[PDB]
Amino acid sequence: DQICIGYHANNSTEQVDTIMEKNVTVTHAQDILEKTHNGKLCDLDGVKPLILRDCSVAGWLLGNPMCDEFINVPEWSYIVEKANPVNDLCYPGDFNDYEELKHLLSRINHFEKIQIIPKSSWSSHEASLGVSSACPYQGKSSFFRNVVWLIKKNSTYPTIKRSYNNTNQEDLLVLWGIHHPKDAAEQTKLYQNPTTYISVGTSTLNQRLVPRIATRSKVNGQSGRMEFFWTILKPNDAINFESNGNFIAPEYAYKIVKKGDSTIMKSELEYGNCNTKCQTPMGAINSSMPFHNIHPLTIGECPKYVKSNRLVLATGLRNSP
Amino acid sequence: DQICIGYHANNSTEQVDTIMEKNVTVTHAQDILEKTHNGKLCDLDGVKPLILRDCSVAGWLLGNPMCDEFINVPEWSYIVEKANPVNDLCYPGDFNDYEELKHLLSRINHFEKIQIIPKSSWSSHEASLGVSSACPYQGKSSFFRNVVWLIKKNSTYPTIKRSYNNTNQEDLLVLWGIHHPKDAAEQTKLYQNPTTYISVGTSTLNQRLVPRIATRSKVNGQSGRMEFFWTILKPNDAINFESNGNFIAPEYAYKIVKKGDSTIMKSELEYGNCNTKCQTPMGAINSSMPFHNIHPLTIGECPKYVKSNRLVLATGLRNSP
Amino acid sequence: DQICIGYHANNSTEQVDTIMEKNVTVTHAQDILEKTHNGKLCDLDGVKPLILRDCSVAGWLLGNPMCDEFINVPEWSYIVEKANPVNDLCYPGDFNDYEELKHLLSRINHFEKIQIIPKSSWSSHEASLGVSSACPYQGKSSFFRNVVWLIKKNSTYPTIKRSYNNTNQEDLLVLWGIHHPKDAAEQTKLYQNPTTYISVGTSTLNQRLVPRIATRSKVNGQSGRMEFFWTILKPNDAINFESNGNFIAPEYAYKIVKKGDSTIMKSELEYGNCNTKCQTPMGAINSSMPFHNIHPLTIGECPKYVKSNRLVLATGLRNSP
Amino acid sequence: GLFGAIAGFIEGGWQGMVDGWYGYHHSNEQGSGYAADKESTQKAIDGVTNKVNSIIDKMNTQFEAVGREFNNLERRIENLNKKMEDGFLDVWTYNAELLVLMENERTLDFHDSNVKNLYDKVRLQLRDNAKELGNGCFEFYHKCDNECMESVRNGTYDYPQY
Amino acid sequence: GLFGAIAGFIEGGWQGMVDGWYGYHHSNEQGSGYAADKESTQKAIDGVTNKVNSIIDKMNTQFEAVGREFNNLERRIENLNKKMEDGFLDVWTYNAELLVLMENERTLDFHDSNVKNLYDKVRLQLRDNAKELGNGCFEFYHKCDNECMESVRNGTYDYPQY
Amino acid sequence: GLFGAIAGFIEGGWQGMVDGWYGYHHSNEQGSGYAADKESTQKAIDGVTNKVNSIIDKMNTQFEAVGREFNNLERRIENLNKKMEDGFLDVWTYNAELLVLMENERTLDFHDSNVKNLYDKVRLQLRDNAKELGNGCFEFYHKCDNECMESVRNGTYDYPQY
Numbered sequence A, B, C: 001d002q003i004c005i006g007y008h009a010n011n012s013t014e015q016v017d018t019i020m021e022k023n024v025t026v027t028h029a030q031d032i033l034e035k036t037h038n039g040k041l042c043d044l045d046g047v048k049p050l051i052l053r054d055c056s057v058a059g060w061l062l063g064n065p066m067c068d069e070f071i072n073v074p075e076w077s078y079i080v081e082k083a084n085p086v087n088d089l090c091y092p093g094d095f096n097d098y099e100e101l102k103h104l105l106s107r108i109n110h111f112e113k114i115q116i117i118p119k120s121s122w123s124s125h126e127a128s129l130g131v132s133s134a135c136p137y138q139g140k141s142s143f144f145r146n147v148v149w150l151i152k153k154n155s156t157y158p159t160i161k162r163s164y165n166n167t168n169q170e171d172l173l174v175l176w177g178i179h180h181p182k183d184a185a186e187q188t189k190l191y192q193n194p195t196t197y198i199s200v201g202t203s204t205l206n207q208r209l210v211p212r213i214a215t216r217s218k219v220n221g222q223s224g225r226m227e228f229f230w231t232i233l234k235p236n237d238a239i240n241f242e243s244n245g246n247f248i249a250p251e252y253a254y255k256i257v258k259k260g261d262s263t264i265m266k267s268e269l270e271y272g273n274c275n276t277k278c279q280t281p282m283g284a285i286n287s288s289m290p291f292h293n294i295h296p297l298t299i300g301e302c303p304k305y306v307k308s309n310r311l312v313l314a315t316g317l318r319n320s321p
Numbered sequence D, E, F: 001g002l003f004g005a006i007a008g009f010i011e012g013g014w015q016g017m018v019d020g021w022y023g024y025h026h027s028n029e030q031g032s033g034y035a036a037d038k039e040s041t042q043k044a045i046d047g048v049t050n051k052v053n054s055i056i057d058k059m060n061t062q063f064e065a066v067g068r069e070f071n072n073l074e075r076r077i078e079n080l081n082k083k084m085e086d087g088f089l090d091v092w093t094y095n096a097e098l099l100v101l102m103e104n105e106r107t108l109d110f111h112d113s114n115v116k117n118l119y120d121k122v123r124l125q126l127r128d129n130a131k132e133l134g135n136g137c138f139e140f141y142h143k144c145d146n147e148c149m150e151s152v153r154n155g156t157y158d159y160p161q162y
């Protein structure tokens, strides 16, 4: 008669690694690394993302006429922009401090477009002929919908002296621009005055731009350029404008109604008609694992990203052959 | 008759954590995390800090007349500045490369204020009427004590051409400024010449400023602005000035007599009449522990900061119930 | 009669450290930290470095006449520059975005110098008298070999309007400059026109420089300054020039024929007539160890840098005294 | 294993013991069978469960990457930003992979230890009332029916009685 | 514990043994009492002391934060700077907390090991001149007075003499 | 050591045993000598070899510094860059030094464990056919010639035969 001491075994083929030995077969294990995703861009917790599609953040905000889909977009969870959006600045040029502004959007979930300077209020300058074949809409020449390319009226461009007061509770993003024409002829042709400027001021801002005239390589048929600027007009502060010509005046500006957690995500994927609590540029994640290896840039309540191909903890003991 | 083998026990209630078990009672333990501080700002090893109180680094250096307490401050260990000091730039404006200069102060323990261009030496321009109600002192209009707001004398502002040579052994911090008036009238009213400039040069510097005239929001009753600049004049090098108007000329500049370990610490606390070898923005630390969890930004011989609430090592063994 | 169980011992004096005990003598150990190097700068895998010696990257690229050794350098593995090269800008001044350009060179292994605007093609301006005693060559006054200091011809400096088209497959680094003279007399003396400019444009670039006239400290006998600029002209794009005077025009520019792994290494050492697979600023490394403590900035297939003085693993067991 | 029991002097595990990690097998005139040892098994479950949660919890605070864009003449700080984000991923990847390796080793040894201790527990009761066979089994000198067997699993094996 | 002695086959510690971590308790006709084992105790003190200092010393080289300020249009690099400073704090916080957990476990097991080894040391002397009781105690077949007891604590227990 | 064998109940190693890490020494009428135990030795070699490569391999992915230069008014980001590069070196230096310390301790204990297990393997065969001397040796009751000795090293020691 006898009594023996022993331990459990089973049909498990699960393997775990250790320092001294690899591929040890064990009775029980626990995977802790999520390797799968759904391959889609989804609502984050019910709140759909802003999917710019073929537009860029500049095209959207300046109101590139190819970007009317985003003429008035509701609150978003995150933003999705392609790597090289085709519809950026239809009239060639620059966007000053573009990246600092993009960074600002990562703290913004909702804009409200409002009209600060009406188009019909420009009684001494021509406001409805500021259009280019570089910015076509529906077969016709058009322009950035949120700014006004003001030109001379009956051969006079008198000094502009306008002011807007932010009476709203909410911070106000304001955008304007300067036109850099191709030659001395175009300068007088569009604006009369040979030497011009745009002076802009707020409580913090002390700007004064001058057009640089030069013949340049043609982009979208244009040798001239448009340099765009922006500021955040605080509540109860006022922005001053003054110009001889070349002024690209604001018509619409955006109220910052909601701040908080957001991100600009670079991805070629479109909308997935879908919901999730964790989103990545390649797809969304639905798991209770403490880790994943899908992609480092995520948004939402997510597992922690590691570069591993495999993380498996032993729970049971060494399984017998 | 028998002999037994056994181990120590006692009345200890000290607990330690392990991977497999938490709150294990042990006979002896050793806390290694300092959790307490004295709540005060103190001398660091005998050397009192510079406590700017209601002044900012700009207010102090430019010599804002509300900041006379710091007219001549001795050597310091560290500097303490509030989050939003009320006495910054009494006349509104900007301070160019302000943060790069602040960063320079983290390597500086002592300044010596010296007069490079005397106020009485301005024989062709008016030097004692450069004052504003924006910078009041003792009920009267005053101005930044270290710079001179030069205006026209008997309706002429002739070209200034001044030079200073750093004959001292020590690097010299020099400060100057440009006035940006509210309108064309003030420009001629103060300086006569409609178009003006300030040109500044050293061995490395090649500057040329021009005032931007514009009507702006009123801050401390001022629509004009003051943009301040600085440089480090090396030993045996010379700084050249040239101007038609709008020149805010240096009177005093600071010698850099001692470099070394320092820091600008952001804190609302005042002086504690106190001494320590380790200081943090919330209070000073006096312990032999290898770790603390008070605050990450410390100065002096300090324990290492961690985010833990608790670090306790077991020394003894598992204590019996 | 008996049988005993036991373990190996030997004459080893090798020691290893553990958490509870230091300097434990063991029968066998394995060092894993490379502590030695050959003290030389060597070819990386057959490909010799560019050793600028007494020239700097600016002196080399602008073609400082003291830097003719590097008039046409072949493909390199890495670049070596001294801490304070004596032959930098022979005529004093600045190099705009110098560090961003240096960073670009860390991605470049080979340049090909080509002539974009011939010196003989300047038929309306004087091109062979742009020389200074600040840039001597062989006892005579000379100048940066890759750019042309154009001055007035028979008392006229007419407007320059030149264009170059990058017809090559390869990106093209282009360099030019602006002269900042000492006074109003020199301006007219060299260029006639009192007010001048240089306007430069590409597809992305919209530049317009103006000389700042001012008397400055003399460096290499010069009170004037030269501010140098650059751009990368993409394939099939064109660069536009326009100027009244002060233009330092390009003659030669560099084709970027090979990109890839490179680095600018700061070292006072010269060429070692030598080969290696791992190079550091103090010397090269030839070992199979997983770690070293020579220097953090290495290039090539290298061990991983740690700050340790000693890393020794135990393989054998505790050796008996 | 470090403790010599699992895949050591006990050559293999038991497919037949389903309701525990460690236990006993008996053989006498009345029959034979497996019985799990509840106390040491539940000890093992509690330890491994706390470990996993300890692991999961320590890794919960860990670096997160953010979107940051830079223009064509901000290459240096773009590169800095890239090296910084990547640097932390390598650190946390190393941390995670190493912790798993180290703790897997400890988990396997812990099971080895629990078996060894269970074996010694029985050895210390039976003392010289049974032959230690050298393979995890004890052969009794007296007959040992199911009550006797149960008394060994109890801890109550009345040594002097036999 | 891994080694089975502490809170295992030895059910609890001794309030009465004050001058050491491990030791002996004897009972005979002349009386009873505790005696600390000096050698194994001092071994334990040296090990734990070296560990603590090893821990303290490794953590001595560690990240320190500096004051760095940025303006309203330097948000990207401000954020970078914040993510960088925070990133290292999380790394060192993890390092510190994990080291304490891991080494606490090792420290407790080390004490378990020292007790087990002390017990085996005595067992290997007494051999079959005493009943191994199963609870840390040995019951002698011969009478064992204080000299006899001392000789066991010595290491000199003259087995053949008894 | 944790397992009590090396520099414990076995007081020292053997200069005379050259062809293995662990083994046996015999003494009888025909002579004496050392014999390495192949199985446990090769086990030790495989474990330590895998460890070293595991260590080398985990450290293979690790931070690399790049050259980055900044001008006189870019001191803040220069400092940031310096603090960042240095920060990672301290992290990897700590990682490397700690791993070596921890694993050195485990390596020494692993050898202790293999010796202890080898000793128990023999003890469990000989059972009561030999005196356990307390120093790693077993004194036989019967005479044990080289075939008998070999049978112990085998695992085949026919206990009932003696």
Ligand SMILES: *[C@@H]1O[C@H](CO)[C@@H](O[C@@H]2O[C@H](CO)[C@@H](O[C@H]3O[C@H](CO[C@H]4O[C@H](CO)[C@@H](O)[C@H](O)[C@@H]4O)[C@@H](O)[C@H](O[C@@H]4O[C@H](CO)[C@@H](O)[C@H](O)[C@@H]4O)[C@@H]3O)[C@H](O)[C@H]2NC(C)=O)[C@H](O)[C@H]1NC(C)=O
Pocket (backbone or CB within 6 Å): A165, A166, A236, A237, A238, B217, B218
């Ligand atoms: C854009 O527009 C807004 C207005 O649409 C501008 O702000 C306004 O600026 C004007 C002056 O230009 C101020 O006028 C009066 O301000 C206060 C109003 O009452 C105060 O107390 C009530 C009590 O509840 C409170 O609701 C108000 O918010 C405010 O605190 C008057 O007291 C003040 O008159 C004063 O009388 C005192 C004693 O008689 C004197 O000592 C003072 O010297 C002063 O004369 C004055 O008549 C508005 O208050 C102010 N509105 C707001 C909401 O701020 C804003 O400035 C403009 N933008 C720019 C850039 O200018």
Ligand SMILES: *[C@@H]1O[C@H](CO)[C@@H](O[C@@H]2O[C@H](CO)[C@@H](O[C@H]3O[C@H](CO[C@H]4O[C@H](CO)[C@@H](O)[C@H](O)[C@@H]4O)[C@@H](O)[C@H](O[C@@H]4O[C@H](CO)[C@@H](O)[C@H](O)[C@@H]4O)[C@@H]3O)[C@H](O)[C@H]2NC(C)=O)[C@H](O)[C@H]1NC(C)=O
Pocket (backbone or CB within 6 Å): B165, B166, B236, B237, B238, C217, C218
């Ligand atoms: C601010 O002010 C200081 C002076 O207050 C300026 O520096 C000075 O510049 C002048 C020229 O403008 C130099 O004049 C003489 O320099 C040396 C002086 O003696 C030399 O050797 C002694 C020996 O111990 C040493 O103490 C000096 O430091 C220096 O090394 C004269 O030798 C020199 O004359 C030379 O004679 C040689 C042979 O006869 C010739 O080959 C040379 O060509 C030359 O003619 C000259 O007369 C001062 O030396 C110099 N002082 C200092 C301390 O640097 C400084 O430049 C100014 N700032 C700016 C921005 O200009």
Ligand SMILES: *[C@@H]1O[C@H](CO)[C@@H](O[C@@H]2O[C@H](CO)[C@@H](O[C@H]3O[C@H](CO[C@H]4O[C@H](CO)[C@@H](O)[C@H](O)[C@@H]4O)[C@@H](O)[C@H](O[C@@H]4O[C@H](CO)[C@@H](O)[C@H](O)[C@@H]4O)[C@@H]3O)[C@H](O)[C@H]2NC(C)=O)[C@H](O)[C@H]1NC(C)=O
Pocket (backbone or CB within 6 Å): A217, A218, C165, C166, C236, C237, C238
């Ligand atoms: C620097 O120099 C280069 C040339 O040395 C400039 O690029 C050239 O720009 C000219 C116009 O200024 C273009 O002219 C013709 O372009 C194409 C050529 O053929 C196309 O298809 C062939 C097929 O294999 C392919 O090899 C070519 O690469 C190209 O794709 C002509 O088709 C075009 O004529 C068109 O006819 C169509 C139908 O008849 C019309 O719809 C079109 O509207 C158009 O009239 C035209 O004659 C060159 O193609 C172009 N070369 C290159 C290599 O790009 C370059 O622009 C300049 N720099 C700057 C900044 O300007």
Ligand SMILES: *[C@H]1O[C@H](CO)[C@@H](O[C@@H]2O[C@H](CO)[C@@H](O[C@@H]3O[C@H](CO)[C@@H](O)[C@H](O)[C@@H]3O)[C@H](O)[C@H]2NC(C)=O)[C@H](O)[C@H]1NC(C)=O
Pocket (backbone or CB within 6 Å): D146, D147, D148, D150, D151, D154, D156
């Ligand atoms: C663990 O197991 C042992 C051995 O089986 C237990 O001892 C046995 O316990 C049973 C059930 O309590 C006893 O049965 C009783 O028998 C008496 C008459 O003899 C009767 O009056 C009761 O109604 C009951 O049926 C049995 O006598 C007893 N046998 C022996 C040999 O001890 C023990 O109780 C268990 N102990 C623990 C701590 O779990």
Ligand SMILES: *[C@H]1O[C@H](CO)[C@@H](O[C@@H]2O[C@H](CO)[C@@H](O[C@@H]3O[C@H](CO)[C@@H](O)[C@H](O)[C@@H]3O)[C@H](O)[C@H]2NC(C)=O)[C@H](O)[C@H]1NC(C)=O
Pocket (backbone or CB within 6 Å): E146, E147, E148, E150, E151, E154, E156
């Ligand atoms: C450890 O303890 C043992 C047992 O107590 C020690 O043996 C004893 O040692 C004492 C003190 O040295 C001896 O006393 C001597 O007695 C003789 C006469 O018999 C006398 O001539 C001496 O002056 C002295 O008083 C005692 O004889 C002896 N007893 C026995 C049974 O061995 C031993 O010395 C200790 N060994 C070590 C290594 O610590």
Ligand SMILES: *[C@H]1O[C@H](CO)[C@@H](O[C@@H]2O[C@H](CO)[C@@H](O[C@@H]3O[C@H](CO)[C@@H](O)[C@H](O)[C@@H]3O)[C@H](O)[C@H]2NC(C)=O)[C@H](O)[C@H]1NC(C)=O
Pocket (backbone or CB within 6 Å): F146, F147, F148, F150, F151, F154, F156
């Ligand atoms: C391990 O060692 C034992 C003990 O030495 C081995 O047993 C011995 O094995 C030898 C060689 O195989 C046997 O020799 C044979 O003798 C017979 C006649 O008796 C002869 O017919 C054969 O040609 C051969 O020479 C020997 O009898 C035997 N002795 C004993 C006491 O067992 C055993 O084989 C080894 N086992 C293992 C698993 O390694």
Ligand SMILES: *[C@@H]1O[C@H](CO)[C@@H](O[C@@H]2O[C@H](CO)[C@@H](O)[C@H](O)[C@H]2NC(C)=O)[C@H](O)[C@H]1NC(C)=O
Pocket (backbone or CB within 6 Å): A022, A023
């Ligand atoms: C341990 O097992 C893994 C996974 O089964 C082995 O890796 C695979 O090896 C096969 C056979 O050579 C390859 O075809 C696969 O590509 C590997 N798969 C993966 C996911 O790595 C691994 O080689 C084994 N390691 C050791 C040390 O034996």
Ligand SMILES: *[C@@H]1O[C@H](CO)[C@@H](O[C@@H]2O[C@H](CO)[C@@H](O)[C@H](O)[C@H]2NC(C)=O)[C@H](O)[C@H]1NC(C)=O
Pocket (backbone or CB within 6 Å): B022, B023
């Ligand atoms: C281990 O002990 C700690 C500290 O005693 C426990 O944490 C406390 O739990 C009490 C009772 O729920 C709370 O009221 C306190 O807020 C806690 N204090 C702290 C400092 O955390 C902890 O819950 C115990 N952990 C386990 C696993 O049992």
Ligand SMILES: *[C@@H]1O[C@H](CO)[C@@H](O[C@@H]2O[C@H](CO)[C@@H](O)[C@H](O)[C@H]2NC(C)=O)[C@H](O)[C@H]1NC(C)=O
Pocket (backbone or CB within 6 Å): C022, C023
């Ligand atoms: C362990 O050994 C090391 C190296 O042998 C000791 O460090 C040396 O100590 C000597 C004697 O004091 C000094 O002169 C050397 O400068 C040291 N060399 C090095 C490389 O550190 C060390 O002191 C010993 N550590 C302990 C804890 O005993």
Ligand SMILES: *[C@@H]1O[C@H](CO)[C@@H](O)[C@H](O)[C@H]1NC(C)=O
Pocket (backbone or CB within 6 Å): A011
């Ligand atoms: C393993 O055994 C289990 C019994 O728990 C059974 O359900 C399962 O089908 C088996 N799996 C395989 C792959 O044989």
Ligand SMILES: *[C@@H]1O[C@H](CO)[C@@H](O)[C@H](O)[C@H]1NC(C)=O
Pocket (backbone or CB within 6 Å): A275, A276, A286, A287
């Ligand atoms: C996530 O996965 C579970 C299954 O694991 C599924 O039942 C659940 O519906 C999923 N949740 C969402 C939000 O898709």
Ligand SMILES: *[C@@H]1O[C@H](CO)[C@@H](O)[C@H](O)[C@H]1NC(C)=O
Pocket (backbone or CB within 6 Å): B011
């Ligand atoms: C614990 O016992 C010690 C004896 O060393 C005594 O000094 C102390 O008062 C006791 N503490 C408590 C809380 O009972």
Ligand SMILES: *[C@@H]1O[C@H](CO)[C@@H](O)[C@H](O)[C@H]1NC(C)=O
Pocket (backbone or CB within 6 Å): B275, B276, B286, B287
């Ligand atoms: C720090 O604390 C100790 C007590 O731990 C105290 O005696 C000493 O005075 C303190 N040191 C200083 C500088 O305050």
Ligand SMILES: *[C@@H]1O[C@H](CO)[C@@H](O)[C@H](O)[C@H]1NC(C)=O
Pocket (backbone or CB within 6 Å): C011
């Ligand atoms: C140690 O012994 C080895 C034998 O393997 C021998 O070759 C060597 O000379 C000895 N070394 C020393 C330092 O005695």
Ligand SMILES: *[C@@H]1O[C@H](CO)[C@@H](O)[C@H](O)[C@H]1NC(C)=O
Pocket (backbone or CB within 6 Å): C275, C276, C286, C287
């Ligand atoms: C590196 O060192 C080995 C000796 O370890 C030597 O034989 C070999 O030639 C060296 N390789 C080179 C490229 O110098």
